[PDB]
Design goal:
Helix content is 60%, strand content 0%. By secondary structure, it is mainly alpha-helical. The chain starts with 9 loop residues before the first helix and ends with a helix. It is classed as antitoxin. Keywords: Toxin peptide from Helicobacter pylori, antitoxin. It forms a monomeric assembly.
Length: 30
């Protein structure tokens, strides 16, 4: 339910983005 063209519900997507962004730093090394 995050697909609203970055409208409100994105933050719910966003902290996921902040999380996996940090985890997809990992998979570069690992």
């Amino acid at each position: 339910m995050a697909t609203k063209h970055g409208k409100n519900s994105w933050k719910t997507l966003y902290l996921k983005i902040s999380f996996l962004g940090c985890k997809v730093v990992v998979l570069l090394k690992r």
